[PDB]
């Protein structure tokens, strides 16, 4: 029954994620009717909203817990399988764990060093002959006892489990980004019972919940590296203007209202810098809007050129750069999509001869892509080769399997299709 329950939880991960999102939306919509006198809820001539928030919060916490269980039971095996495959290939080919011995850097390898000693090291890679292969290839160079020591194979209780492999798996799933995001979701949902306003932070799930919103938000993320540098450049420029203003025009920054008020000014550097960052980049017209004009002063022309240069170098150029980064992001994304479409429509993926050679036959290129060189056909062939005992392999199947084990990929056609090699008319 537990296995069936876990399979049911895994099968409906996305549906219950959307359910959690809708529940959070409902909680926020109810949250919108607060009022202070302390923080009592006001209802539109009703009294049935008193437990609706509580039951919705309980439902949200339960659904979020089910979401994290389903994610741990469905998407985690992909991460484990990828990590095991990568470490197995590295150990078999490079042999870095016995030759290179990586340093304190590359923490991933150091953490993966804890899985070699485990008995069930290829738990998901379906290739349990990796230890035998590495022994057969390294025994005559690194001995036999050293490799054996390094590998180290020698409903009531169920205590016969490998705790080292479980610890390594728990370590490697904690560093995953999606699991960390789900843990943050758990923390926010749990904290929502202490304070009802903590459920507002769950609205950020719409950033990744909708595909059409990820394309919008990818424009900012595409050039997000340069946006912070632009902000830093703006901060440096504002600081330089602050230094000039403090050194020369310190007497203008006086905020006196209708005469008879105490003289409030900006004397020290920190106050002037906060004034320039808070006002002047915000006023829409630079710093000259909120300072008195130099009507009849010896520094009038200097103040005028200072204001004009500050405006033209902060409010115009920097903002133009900030919008330009987003515009270039949109253009780059569209150009990449167009290039991908053209590359897929102008040559086939496997050998890439080109459609011009296949246009001699009517609809030749479409037939070639759909029958001769098809990605689905290659994937099905690879799966059928994997899920087949070696005793039943034919000559071609054994040949392909041997090159797949050696990982040479000379059997993939490249620049030579069936029509090019075996012409219909003998020549």
């Amino acid at each position: 029954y537990q296995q069936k329950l876990l399979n049911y939880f895994a099968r409906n991960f996305y549906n219950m994620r959307m359910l959690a999102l809708f529940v959070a939306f409902a909680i926020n919509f109810i949250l919108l009717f607060y009022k202070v006198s302390v923080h009592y809820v006001l209802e539109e001539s009703s009294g049935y909203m008193e437990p609706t928030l509580r039951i919705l919060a309980i439902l949200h916490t339960i659904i979020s817990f089910f979401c994290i269980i389903g994610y741990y039971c469905l998407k985690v095996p992909l991460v484990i399988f990828k990590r095991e495959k990568e470490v197995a290939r590295k150990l078999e080919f490079d042999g870095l764990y016995i030759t290179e011995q990586p340093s304190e850097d590359d923490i991933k390898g150091q953490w993966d060093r804890l899985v070699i000693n485990t008995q069930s090291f290829p738990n998901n890679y379906w290739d349990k002959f990796v230890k035998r292969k590495v022994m057969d290839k390294y025994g005559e160079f690194y001995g036999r006892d050293r490799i054996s020591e390094l590998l180290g194979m020698d409903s009531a209780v169920l205590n016969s489990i490998d705790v080292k492999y479980q610890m390594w798996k728990l370590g490697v799933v904690f560093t995953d980004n999606s699991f960390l995001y789900l843990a943050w979701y758990m923390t926010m949902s749990v904290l929502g019972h202490y304070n009802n306003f903590f459920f507002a932070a769950h609205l950020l799930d719409i950033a990744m919940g909708f595909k059409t919103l990820r394309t919008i938000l990818s424009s900012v993320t595409h050039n997000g590296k340069q946006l912070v540098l632009t902000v830093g450049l703006l901060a440096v420029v504002v600081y330089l203007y602050t230094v000039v203003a403090f050194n020369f025009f310190r007497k203008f920054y006086n905020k006196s209202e209708d005469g008879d008020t105490p003289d409030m000014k900006c004397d020290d550097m920190l106050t002037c810098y906060m004034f320039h960052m808070y006002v002047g980049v915000r006023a829409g017209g630079g710093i000259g809007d909120e300072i008195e004009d130099p009507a009849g002063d010896e520094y009038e022309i200097y103040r005028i050129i200072f204001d004009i240069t500050f405006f033209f170098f902060v409010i115009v150029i920097l903002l133009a750069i900030i919008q330009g980064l987003i515009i270039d992001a949109f253009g780059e994304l569209r150009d990449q999509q167009e290039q991908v479409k053209e590359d897929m429509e102008t040559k086939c993926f496997i050998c890439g001869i080109g459609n011009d050679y296949f246009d001699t036959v009517p609809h030749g290129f479409e037939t070639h892509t759909l029958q001769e060189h098809n990605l689905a056909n290659y994937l099905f062939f690879l799966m059928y080769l994997i899920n087949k005992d070696e005793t039943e392999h034919t000559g071609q199947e054994s040949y392909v399997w041997k090159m797949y084990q050696e990982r040479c990929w000379e059997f993939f056609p490249a620049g030579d299709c069936f029509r090019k090699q075996y012409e219909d008319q003998l020549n």
Partner: protein
């Protein structure tokens, strides 16, 4: 059998003649699995593979076209279960390879998640580029998709 079965002794009477496994004059659960389930599934598949191999390897043969056209029913039934790939043979010549495609895998490849993963893989390959790394990336994607379909088979 009144849709596509014609009233002839060789076909209509044949099923009734083969329905001699019960003395109670009624059908049973074992009839449709004893026959036409374990045989006539891989036996006919090999015949279809042989016929299509002969047709592809000997184009424009007058005698072979009649054979292809008379046996169109079996080949049409075996269209979804036929795989056609091209590999570089041991004799430095392109050789066709035929195999069997399982029905569950065929269903599992039409899911939107697998199509989205394939589209993302193509996008990443074209963006990053490379030729030697291209086949390694393709094989890695194939292995990941195979593992995902095997995991999703356990519903």
């Amino acid at each position: 059998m009144e849709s596509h079965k014609h009233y002839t002794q060789s076909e209509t009477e044949f099923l009734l003649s083969c329905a001699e496994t019960d003395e109670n004059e009624t059908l049973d659960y074992e009839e449709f699995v004893k026959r036409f389930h374990e045989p006539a599934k891989d036996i006919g598949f090999n015949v279809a593979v042989l016929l299509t191999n002969l047709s592809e390897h000997m184009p424009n043969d007058t005698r072979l076209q009649t054979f292809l056209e008379l046996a169109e029913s079996v080949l049409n039934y075996f269209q979804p279960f036929l795989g056609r790939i091209e590999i570089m043979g041991s004799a430095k010549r392109i050789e066709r390879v035929y195999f069997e495609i399982s029905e569950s895998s065929r269903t599992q490849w039409e899911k939107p998640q697998v199509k989205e993963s394939k589209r993302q893989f193509i996008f990443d390959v074209v963006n990053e580029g490379g030729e030697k790394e291209k086949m390694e990336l393709f094989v890695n994607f194939c292995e990941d998709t195979i593992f995902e379909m095997q995991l999703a088979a356990q519903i």
